[PDB]
Symmetry: D2
Subunit: 171 residues, 4 copies
Amino acid sequence: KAVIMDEQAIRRALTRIAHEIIERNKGIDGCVLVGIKTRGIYLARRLAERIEQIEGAPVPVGEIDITLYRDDDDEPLVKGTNVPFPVTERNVILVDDVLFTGRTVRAGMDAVMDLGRPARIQLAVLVDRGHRELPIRADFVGKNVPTSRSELIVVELDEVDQNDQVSIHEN
Amino acid sequence: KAVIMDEQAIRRALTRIAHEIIERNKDGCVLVGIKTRGIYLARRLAERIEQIEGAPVPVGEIDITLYRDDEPLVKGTNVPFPVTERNVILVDDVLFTGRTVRAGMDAVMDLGRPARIQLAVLVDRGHRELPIRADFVGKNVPTSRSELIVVELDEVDQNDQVSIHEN
Amino acid sequence: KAVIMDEQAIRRALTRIAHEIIERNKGIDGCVLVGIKTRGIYLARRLAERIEQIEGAPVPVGEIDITLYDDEPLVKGTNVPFPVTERNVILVDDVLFTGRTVRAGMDAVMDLGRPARIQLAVLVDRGHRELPIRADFVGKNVPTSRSELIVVELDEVDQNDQVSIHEN
Amino acid sequence: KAVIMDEQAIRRALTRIAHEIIERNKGIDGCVLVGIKTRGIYLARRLAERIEQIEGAPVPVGEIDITLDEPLVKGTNVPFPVTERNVILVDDVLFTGRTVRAGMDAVMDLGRPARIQLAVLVDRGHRELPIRADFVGKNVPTSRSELIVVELDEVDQNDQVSIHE
Ligand SMILES: O=c1ccn([C@@H]2O[C@H](COP(=O)(O)O)[C@@H](O)[C@H]2O)c(=O)[nH]1
Ligand SMILES: O=c1ccn([C@@H]2O[C@H](COP(=O)(O)O)[C@@H](O)[C@H]2O)c(=O)[nH]1
Ligand SMILES: O=c1ccn([C@@H]2O[C@H](COP(=O)(O)O)[C@@H](O)[C@H]2O)c(=O)[nH]1
Ligand SMILES: O=c1ccn([C@@H]2O[C@H](COP(=O)(O)O)[C@@H](O)[C@H]2O)c(=O)[nH]1
């Protein structure tokens, strides 16, 4: 095990991502955040808080539930959605903690597309660890973390582990 | 209305892309072309790779098009090999919003369970509307929304050329 | 000509750069800002103010005067009133084009001392690099043709904040 | 301590970089290669041989001798003009970027090139100056403490790249 981001690094990466989202969309008009799974939902909320602070207006947040990577043959499935607003003609930013193969994000993208025809779908992740297996990229990235295939990235968030931290495990 | 790649620039981009594919994809990989122009580039890429490595590369086809209330949809496929556990490289002429590549990716996923899907395009013109990127890119060409990129290939236009139009 | 950034877009880009600078360096300990030319100096000061607001300690600012005599740019003078040795120096300029101005500025900093790191922040990167130089922090990437020109107007000296493209 | 590129991976990377050099410059007109230090010179010769095979014209090759703890230029054996040329510097590894900046200064003392570009076999990160390669064989992430070692046939009698310490 080793620690690769601490609470401060995380706070700092999220704050920069928020500015980038506002910058790239010329304000938050028409933007919604949709979080993926538990940790993604927590990050999307954090991102929404910060953007409200910065711009003075709130950002809607939505949820998508997808099967687990960890706690094993797999192909991830959307269990459910909780998006209580329209997505058509909106700029939807998916949020997740780690981008690995990209297969989870693709399922989240499909779920949004079943709900509506958004203008744009964008992606924000806290960690991009490589090993992509689909042609998918994040628009906003907190840290690029190289890894070997056998390593694991674990993101601890305050809302459930009571410390904010990112670390690598050898497996 | 300007020419931005000529026959020689196109030849040089494809030859570099073929070497990149081999480097990254060191066995085999397969090529699946999208629409008429994407199928011609995949064939060209396959031919270059056999010349460089001495083995053939299988090539597959996806036919895509548009229908009314907008999104592109898959008409048919001709992939005469299994895609399961394979490294599939989608090929198209231009990456724009990314919606066409997403339909092609979806078609490959119906056929099988590949190990990997990668993307090679001759031109990436920006204005992505989905979170999609190309692994291999011939040229990044900035454009405004109102411009259009037109790729002409020997096989059907009898001149190899890439140009920008407005409208 | 056309307008590609306005006062609000510029403000948002500088605010974001300031947060990236802090993030990348894990706080501003040991960091100094050195602006290049008139417009680069103004941007370095703005960045310094923002960083202070964000982080509560000030950032020293320095200046380098580059003047023009392929007409190669030359360092006229410097006013860096602190040491640069073992510091992280962030050069600041208006527009990154061929990279030749930044290379002179880099050469000036290396005469003054031996820094730990030299980094670069620019408001606009317009391409056409002629030396192997890149910016660490970029406000906006703006594609251009060789013949076009990027003009940055800052409040301090033009009374309007904006960036625009001209031809010839 | 691992092998990160083998002889075949090196061969392929150089072949690809050569095609990228021709593409980016639309042929080799006005292009010269200047290698840095011993290993950079060997790579520049290899690149030049590869480009001649591909385009059927030779590419001149120059040498810059750099030493050490500021790296500084001990020698410059560039027997052609550089003014208005497209000069591609070549080295084995890009680390802090300080060696490449000394090579860039040495070329600028010789004349005014149209362009200076950079080709390296390995880019290992940890830049300390705002410098990047145009052409890169492999991006290899590393920690500050690790070391990249490049072995070439001409002087080590094996072609290989590895990570050390
Ligand atoms: O090292 C990893 C890899 C994957 N995941 C989880 O799986 C998804 C990413 O894997 P993939 O679908 O991109 O392969 C994310 O939701 C992430 O939470 C991790 O938490 N850590
Ligand atoms: O400027 C353009 C835009 C689109 N297309 C064609 O339409 C699709 C555009 O992709 P997208 O907007 O769905 O990414 C591709 O098949 C491509 O052949 C072009 O040829 N040029
Ligand atoms: O389109 C341009 C080109 C150059 N410059 C000015 O010249 C320098 C950048 O040119 P270069 O030396 O990077 O080519 C900067 O100081 C910038 O202020 C511009 O403002 N706009
Ligand atoms: O891991 C390393 C680091 C440096 N160097 C050598 O020293 C210079 C390092 O570059 P830099 O620290 O000057 O960027 C290059 O010539 C290279 O030959 C290596 O070979 N491997």
